[PDB]
C-alpha cells in the first residue's frame, strides 16, 4: 500500500475518541489531569446547563463521530472528556502548500451552558507560551478570530446561528480559512495590496517568520512533549510523514536562500533562515529517535 493509503487507513480509527481529562479528588471535588485553558470557566459554570444543550451535544457527537475531515494534506482530531461532552480538545494538522504544513496545532473547546444559543469558546494552545502570533486571526494570547463565533450585529448569514451553525463548520472554517497558503493577506485592508512587489515581500517575510515558528512549536515541541490526549496520534503522524516533512523544510530553506530585492526584508529573511536551520537540525535529531508505531 502507498504511504498515503496507510496514513488514511491508520488515522481513520482515531479521529474521535474520549480521554480521561477529569478524575475524582477528595471532599467531593474534581481536578484536571490535563492542561485545559477553560478550566476556570468550567468550574465557574458548575452544573448549570440549558435543557436543549444535552440534545444538541448528543447530535454534535453523532455528527463528529463520522463527519470530521481526513486527508493526507490535513486532518482534524477531536477528543472529549469521558464524562463530559462540553469539554473538548482539537488537533488540526496544517494543510500542504501552506506555512503551517504538517504542523500539529492544538485547541481547547468549551461549550457554555447556554449552548447552542451562545457560540462555543475556542482557544489556541500552540502559541509557544504566547511568544508567537501564527496568524492575524490567531492572537498570541490564544484568542481565535472568526465571524461565525460572534453574536454581535454583523449580518444574519455571518453571525452565530442557533440552527445553521455547528462545531464541524467552525472546525472547517479554522482549518481552511485561517491556515491559508498566504496568511499575511488575512488582515483586512492588506487583502487588496496583493500582486504588488511590496505586498509580495511582506508576505514572504510573514511566511519566513511562520516557517520557523511552526517548525519550532508545531513539530519539535509536539514531538518532545506531546499532549496526553493526542500522544499516539502525533507520534503516528510524525513517523509516517518524516521524509515528507524533511523534504518540505529543505524546500523552505532553499526558498529562503533566494536573493531579495529590499535590504529591510532581506535581513529579517536571513535571520529567520538561520533560526530555521537551527530548529531543523534539532527536528532531524528528534525524528530519528521516533520508534516505529506497532
Amino acid at each position: 500500500k502507498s504511504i498515503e493509503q496507510r496514513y488514511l487507513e491508520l488515522m481513520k480509527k482515531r479521529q474521535f475518541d474520549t480521554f480521561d481529562m477529569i478524575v475524582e479528588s477528595d471532599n467531593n471535588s474534581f481536578r484536571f489531569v490535563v492542561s485545559h485553558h477553560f478550566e476556570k470557566m468550567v468550574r465557574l459554570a458548575g452544573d448549570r446547563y440549558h435543557p436543549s444543550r444535552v440534545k444538541r451535544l448528543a447530535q454534535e457527537a453523532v455528527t463528529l463521530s463520522t463527519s470530521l475531515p481526513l486527508s493526507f494534506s490535513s486532518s482534524v482530531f477531536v477528543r472529549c472528556d469521558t464524562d463530559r461532552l462540553d469539554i473538548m480538545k482539537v488537533l488540526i494538522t496544517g494543510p500542504a502548500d501552506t506555512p503551517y504544513a504538517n504542523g500539529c496545532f492544538e485547541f481547547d473547546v468549551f461549550f457554555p451552558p447556554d449552548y447552542p444559543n451562545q457560540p462555543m469558546l475556542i482557544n489556541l494552545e500552540t502559541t509557544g507560551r504566547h511568544s508567537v502570533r501564527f496568524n492575524p486571526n490567531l492572537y498570541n494570547d490564544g484568542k481565535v478570530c472568526l465571524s461565525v463565533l460572534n453574536t454581535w450585529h454583523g449580518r444574519p448569514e455571518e453571525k452565530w446561528n442557533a440552527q445553521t451553525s455547528s462545531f464541524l463548520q467552525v472546525l472547517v472554517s479554522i482549518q481552511s480559512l485561517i491556515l491559508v497558503p498566504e496568511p499575511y493577506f488575512n488582515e483586512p485592508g492588506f487583502e487588496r495590496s496583493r500582486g504588488s512587489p511590496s505586498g509580495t515581500n511582506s508576505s514572504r517575510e510573514y511566511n519566513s517568520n511562520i516557517y520557523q515558528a511552526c517548525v519550532r512549536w508545531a513539530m519539535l515541541e509536539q514531538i518532545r512533549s506531546p499532549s496526553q490526549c493526542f500522544k499516539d496520534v502525533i507520534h503516528k503522524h510524525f513517523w509516517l510523514k518524516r521524509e515528507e516533512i524533511c523534504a518540505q523544510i529543505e524546500g523552505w530553506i532553499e526558498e529562503l536562500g533566494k536573493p531579495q530585492y529590499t535590504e529591510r526584508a532581506s535581513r529579517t529573511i536571513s535571520f529567520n533562515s538561520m533560526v530555521l536551520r537551527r530548529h531543523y537540525r534539532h527536528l532531524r535529531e528528534e525524528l530519528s529517535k521516533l520508534k516505529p508505531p506497532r
Binding site: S35, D47, P51, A58, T82, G189
Partner: protein, 976 residues
C-alpha cells in the same frame, strides 16, 4: 443636585432633567384607600417635592383588605392621618403632610398635580372644571372589585420632551448621493434602525461639512439600509465619514376637559381580546354614581341578582348606546368588593401618570384607561350566601371571591424566589391576600443583603436595615402589616448547591412558585425544578419601564425554557483590542484592564503568601501551568513590588505611557495612518478610527485623575498607605523618568530555579490583596479609574467621552428599575397566581402580560400549549416522563428499555454528565455495566449522593427498532 447614591437606578430611567422637574412639583392625593395608598407609596418613592394626603372617610374593617398601613386599632381614625406617619418614612427627601379640610379653590392652587379617588360625581366634575380652567393636572382613578378606571387631563397645552423613553441611535455613513433626493447609505450594509419620518443630525462629515451640527432634518426611510434627507445639491461633494444621530423631537398635545371628554372618549386598549369592554365599562362606571344616589349612597350588594337587575336598568336609562348586558351584570355583582393586586397595578399606573405630569417625560394615557380581571372569578360564579361578610379583615375580598376561596387561600403554600423589588411587592400582595394564613405558608429566599440603592424601589426596607438579609427583613416587615401571615425565610441562593434544603420533599408540598430573580440561570433552574415536581410557576421580569409576566401550568403550557431570548451581545476581539469605535468598547477595555491589573496579577501571589504548601501543590500541575503560575508569582512579588508610594506613582506613569503612547505607536507602525487600499478606500476609514498617541500633561485633569486613581489602587493592592492628595501626586509624577520606546516589526530546572528565588528573595510578610470591583462605593476609586481609563482611550481614538453616569451604567452592567413598573408587574403576577389557585386549567383564562409604561402600552396573550411529539404512536410533551423504580444495574436499565419501550439507548446522560454512550471506551463500558445506577452516577459525577436525594433524572437518546433516532421523554429513576 440629585442624590445619585439613592436614585441611582431611577436616574437611568427618568433622567436628570425629569428628576429636577419632579423635585419642584407638589402633589395632592384625595382618598387613602388601597389604591390611594399604592399611589402615594409609588409617588413618594419617586421623589416628588412634597405630597399632601387628604381624606374624609374613616378607617373600617373593609379597608384592611388592601390598606397595609392600617391596623384594627386604627378603626375610627382618619385614613390619611393614620397612614401619613408611616408613609413619611419611605423617603426623607419628600415632605408628607395630611389634610382633612374641604377642597376649596384656594387650597387647590398650591398643587401641580391633583389625584382624585373615591370622590363623588359632583365633586369630581367641580374639581375637574376648576383644574382645567386653572392649568392644574388632574388624574381620576377608581377600582371596583376586579375593574379599574383611569382618567388623565394634563391641561390645554402639555409638552412631552421624550415621547417613548428609548435612547437615540446613531449610524455611520458610507455614501451620500448629491442630487435633489440625496440618499444616505449605511456602512457595509448595516441596518440603521431609523423609523420613518424621524429627525436626524449629522456630525464628522467630510466634504458635506455644512451638514455638521445642522438642525434636525425629516428623513424618509427608503429601505432597511438607506434613507433620504431631501435636497443635497446645495452642499459640496461627499468625500467620506459622517455619523447620523437620531434626535428626539418634542410634541405638544391638548387634553380635553372631563366635562367634554366624557361624551367623546378616547380609550387606551389594555386587552386586545376585549375591544368592546371599555365602551361598556365607561357607562357602568358613570352609572354607578346614579345608582348610589338612588340607593342612599350604597353600592349593590355582592352577588345579588335584584341589585344587579336594578343597576342594569339604571345603565339602560342613563345611556342610549348598546352595552354588554352580561358585562354590566357581572360588574354590578362584584362592584362592592376590593382586592390588593388590582389596586397595586392601578396605583403603579397612576403613579407613572403623576410622574409624567410632573416631569413632562413619556406619553400620558390619552385619555381613558379601563382594565378588568374577570378571568380570576370561578366559571360557575359565586353564590350570594358565600359572599356575605363574616366580620373579618378580608370582607372586601370575600365580597368578590367568597369564603370558600378564602379558605383555599389560607391553606395554600407558595414559594417566592428572590426578595428584590418584585419579591417584596409579591410578598406584600400575598400577605394582604391572606395566602397561607391558615395551614399554609409563604416561603421566601434571598442570598443578598440590603444596600442603600435598594431603598429607592423596595418599600419594605429602611435606612437602618442596611447590611441585614433581605428575606428576613421583608418577612418581618410583612408580618407587621398583617399579623396572621405565616412566613419562612431563607438566606440561600437557589441552585444545585442548596438542594439539601430545597429538596424534593420541600417542593412536594408546594402549590406554586413565583419568580422574582434578575438572572437567567436561576430562572432556568427554577423551571427545571417546577417541571420535575409538576407545580405551576409564574415568571416576572422588568427592565426600566418595560415588564412581562409568563405563566407556566403543568400538562397545559410550554415552559420558559421552551422559547429563547436574544443572546448577550459580545464585542469582536479586534474591536476591543485594536479598533474601537464606541464608548462601550473603551469601557469594556477599561474594565478588563482593571481586572487584569488589580485582581488577576495578585491572586497567585496572595495564594502563595497565605498557603505555605502552595509551591508543592502547584508543582504537580500538568503542562506549562506550574511555570505560568510561578513566573506570575515572581513578577508580582519581586519584580513589580513597590516599596513606597513613589514607586506606585512611577508604575502608574509607566502604565499610562505604555497604554496610551507605546501600544498606539506600535499599532500605527503596523498600519500607517495614510494607508489606502487598492480600490480607493483608506484602511483607516469606516468603522476603524485612526488613533494618535497622547502627550502627558500634569495640568490635564484627565491624566492627573488617571495617575491618582491608578497609584492609589496599586498602593491599596500592596498594603501601602494611600496618599489622597492631588497636589502631592502631581508633584511626585513630574519626577518620573520615562524610558524611550521604539516600534518593532529544562522546564523542571526553571521550576526549581523560580522556587529557589521565591524562597530566598521573596518575603512572606507582604500583604498582597486582589481588589474586588465595587461600583456602588464612591470612596474606593474603582469607578474613577474606570472613567479615566475609558476616557483616555476614547481621546486616543477621537471617540466622544462619557461622564461618570454613563460609564457606571455601562461598565457596571446596571439594570435600570423603577417602582411603578415593579408594582404593575407584581399586581399582574398576583392576578395570575389567584387564577392558578382558583383551579383554572383552560389556557384562555390565563394571560401572559407585557407592558411598557412609557408609551403607555399593555397587552396580553394566551400561553402557548406544550409541543406534542409521537414515538411509536404515543403522544408526549415536556411534562411526561418514564418511571423506573428500584435499584437496577446499567445493563438492567438498558435491557428494561429495550424490552418494554422497544428503544435502544445510544446515549444516557445525567445533567452535564455522560453515563453511557455508543462511542465510549470498551473497558469503561464493561466496567460500568454490572454496577448499580447510583454507583455509576457517583463515579461519573465525581461526587457523593446525598441522603436527601430520593430520585434521579436521566436524559436518553434512543433508536427505534428500525434504527432511526426518536425523541423520548426524560426518565425519573426512583432510588430504593
Amino acid at each position: 443636585d440629585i442624590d445619585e447614591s439613592l436614585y441611582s437606578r431611577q436616574l437611568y430611567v427618568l433622567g436628570h432633567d425629569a428628576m429636577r422637574r419632579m423635585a419642584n412639583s407638589d402633589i395632592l392625593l384625595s382618598g387613602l384607600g388601597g389604591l390611594g395608598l399604592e399611589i402615594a407609596k409609588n409617588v413618594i418613592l419617586g421623589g416628588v417635592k412634597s405630597i399632601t394626603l387628604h381624606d374624609t372617610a374613616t378607617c373600617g374593617l373593609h379597608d384592611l383588605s388592601s390598606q397595609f398601613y392600617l391596623t384594627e386599632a386604627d378603626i375610627g381614625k382618619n385614613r390619611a392621618e393614620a397612614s401619613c406617619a408611616q408613609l413619611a418614612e419611605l423617603n426623607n427627601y419628600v415632605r408628607t403632610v395630611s389634610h382633612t379640610g374641604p377642597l376649596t379653590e384656594e387650597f387647590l392652587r398650591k398643587f401641580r398635580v391633583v389625584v382624585l379617588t373615591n370622590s363623588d360625581g359632583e365633586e369630581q366634575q367641580r374639581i375637574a372644571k376648576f383644574a382645567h380652567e386653572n392649568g392644574i393636572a388632574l388624574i381620576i382613578a377608581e377600582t371596583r372589585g376586579l375593574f379599574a378606571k383611569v382618567f388623565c387631563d394634563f391641561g390645554e397645552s402639555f409638552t412631552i420632551y421624550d415621547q417613548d423613553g428609548t435612547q437615540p441611535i446613531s449610524t455611520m455613513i458610507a455614501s451620500i448621493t448629491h442630487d435633489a433626493q440625496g440618499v444616505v447609505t449605511c456602512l457595509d450594509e448595516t441596518r440603521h434602525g431609523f423609523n420613518d419620518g424621524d429627525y436626524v443630525t449629522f456630525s464628522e462629515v467630510q466634504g458635506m461639512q455644512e451638514l455638521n451640527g445642522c438642525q434636525p432634518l425629516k428623513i424618509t426611510v427608503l429601505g432597511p439600509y438607506t434613507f433620504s434627507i431631501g435636497d443635497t445639491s446645495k452642499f459640496g461633494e461627499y468625500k467620506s465619514g459622517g455619523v447620523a444621530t437620531q434626535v428626539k423631537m418634542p410634541k405638544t398635545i391638548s387634553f380635553k376637559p372631563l366635562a367634554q371628554a366624557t361624551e367623546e372618549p378616547e380609550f387606551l386598549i389594555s386587552d386586545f381580546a376585549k375591544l368592546d369592554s371599555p365602551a361598556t365599562l365607561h357607562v357602568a362606571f358613570n352609572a354607578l354614581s346614579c345608582y348610589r344616589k338612588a340607593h342612599n349612597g350604597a353600592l349593590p350588594r355582592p352577588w345579588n341578582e335584584e341589585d344587579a337587575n336594578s343597576f342594569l336598568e339604571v345603565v339602560r336609562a342613563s345611556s342610549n348606546a348598546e352595552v354588554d348586558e352580561k358585562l354590566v351584570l357581572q360588574f354590578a355583582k362584584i362592584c362592592s368588593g376590593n382586592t390588593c393586586p388590582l389596586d397595586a397595578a392601578v396605583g403603579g399606573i397612576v403613579a407613572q401618570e403623576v410622574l409624567k405630569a410632573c416631569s413632562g417625560k413619556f406619553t400620558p394615557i390619552y385619555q381613558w384607561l379601563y382594565f378588568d380581571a374577570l378571568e380570576c372569578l370561578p366559571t360557575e360564579g359565586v353564590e350570594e350566601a358565600d359572599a356575605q361578610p363574616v366580620g373579618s379583615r378580608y370582607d372586601s375580598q370575600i365580597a368578590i371571591f367568597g369564603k370558600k376561596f378564602q379558605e383555599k387561600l389560607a391553606d395554600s403554600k407558595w414559594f417566592i424566589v428572590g426578595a428584590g423589588a418584585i419579591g417584596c411587592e409579591l410578598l406584600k400582595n400575598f400577605g394582604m391576600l391572606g395566602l397561607g394564613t391558615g395551614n399554609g405558608q409563604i416561603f421566601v429566599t434571598d442570598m443578598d443583603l440590603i444596600e442603600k440603592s435598594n431603598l429607592n424601589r423596595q418599600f419594605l426596607f429602611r435606612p437602618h436595615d442596611v447590611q441585614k438579609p433581605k428575606s428576613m427583613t421583608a418577612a418581618d416587615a410583612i408580618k407587621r402589616m398583617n399579623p396572621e401571615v405565616n412566613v419562612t425565610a431563607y438566606e440561600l441562593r437557589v441552585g444545585a448547591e442548596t438542594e439539601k434544603v430545597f429538596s424534593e420533599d420541600f417542593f412536594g408540598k408546594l402549590d406554586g412558585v413565583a419568580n422574582a430573580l434578575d438572572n437567567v440561570d436561576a430562572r432556568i433552574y427554577m423551571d427545571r425544578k417546577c417541571i420535575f415536581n409538576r407545580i405551576p410557576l409564574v415568571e416576572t421580569g422588568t427592565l426600566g419601564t418595560l415588564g412581562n409576566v409568563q405563566v407556566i401550568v403543568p400538562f397545559a403550557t410550554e415552559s420558559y425554557s421552551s422559547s429563547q431570548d436574544p443572546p448577550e451581545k459580545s464585542i469582536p476581539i479586534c474591536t476591543l483590542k485594536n479598533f474601537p469605535n464606541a464608548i462601550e468598547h473603551t469601557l469594556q477595555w477599561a474594565r478588563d484592564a482593571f481586572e487584569g491589573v488589580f485582581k488577576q496579577s495578585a491572586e497567585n501571589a496572595a495564594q502563595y503568601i497565605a498557603d505555605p504548601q502552595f509551591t508543592e501543590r502547584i508543582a504537580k500541575l500538568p503542562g506549562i501551568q506550574p511555570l505560568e503560575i510561578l513566573d506570575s508569582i515572581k513578577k508580582a512579588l519581586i519584580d513589580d513590588k513597590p516599596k513606597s508610594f513613589a514607586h506606585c506613582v512611577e508604575w502608574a506613569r509607566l502604565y499610562w505611557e505604555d497604554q496610551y503612547v507605546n501600544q498606539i505607536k506600535q499599532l500605527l507602525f503596523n498600519f500607517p495612518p495614510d494607508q489606502i487600499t487598492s480600490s480607493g478606500q483608506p484602511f483607516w476609514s469606516g468603522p476603524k478610527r485612526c488613533p494618535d498617541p497622547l502627550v502627558f500633561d500634569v495640568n490635564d485633569p484627565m491624566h492627573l485623575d488617571f495617575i491618582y486613581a491608578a497609584a492609589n489602587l496599586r498602593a491599596e493592592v500592596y498594603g501601602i498607605e494611600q496618599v489622597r492628595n492631588r497636589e502631592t501626586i502631581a508633584e511626585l509624577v513630574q519626577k518620573v523618568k520615562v524610558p524611550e520606546f521604539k516600534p518593532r516589526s529544562l522546564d523542571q530546572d526553571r521550576v526549581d530555579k523560580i522556587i529557589s528565588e521565591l524562597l530566598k528573595n521573596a518575603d512572606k510578610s507582604s500583604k498582597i490583596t486582589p481588589l474586588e470591583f465595587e461600583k456602588d462605593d464612591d470612596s474606593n476609586l474603582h469607578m474613577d479609574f474606570i472613567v479615566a481609563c475609558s476616557n483616555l482611550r476614547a481621546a486616543n481614538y477621537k471617540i466622544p467621552p462619557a461622564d461618570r453616569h454613563k460609564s457606571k451604567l455601562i461598565a457596571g452592567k446596571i439594570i435600570p428599575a423603577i417602582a411603578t413598573t415593579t408594582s404593575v408587574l407584581s399586581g399582574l403576577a398576583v392576578l395570575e397566581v389567584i387564577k392558578l389557585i382558583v383551579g383554572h386549567r383552560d389556557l384562555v383564562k390565563f394571560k401572559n402580560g407585557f407592558a411598557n409604561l412609557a408609551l403607555p402600552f399593555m397587552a396580553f396573550s394566551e400561553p402557548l400549549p406544550a409541543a406534542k411529539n409521537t414515538y411509536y404512536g404515543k403522544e408526549w410533551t415536556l411534562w411526561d416522563r418514564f418511571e423506573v423504580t428500584g435499584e437496577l444495574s446499567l445493563q438492567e436499565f438498558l435491557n428494561y428499555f429495550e424490552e418494554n419501550e422497544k428503544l435502544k439507548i445510544t446515549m444516557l446522560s445525567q445533567g452535564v454528565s455522560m453515563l453511557y454512550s455508543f462511542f465510549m471506551p470498551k473497558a469503561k463500558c464493561s466496567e460500568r455495566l454490572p454496577l448499580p445506577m447510583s454507583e455509576v452516577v457517583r463515579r461519573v459525577s465525581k461526587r457523593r449522593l446525598e441522603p436527601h436525594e430520593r430520585s434521579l433524572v436521566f436524559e436518553i437518546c434512543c433508536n427505534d427498532v428500525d434504527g432511526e433516532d426518536v425523541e423520548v421523554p426524560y426518565v425519573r429513576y426512583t432510588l430504593p
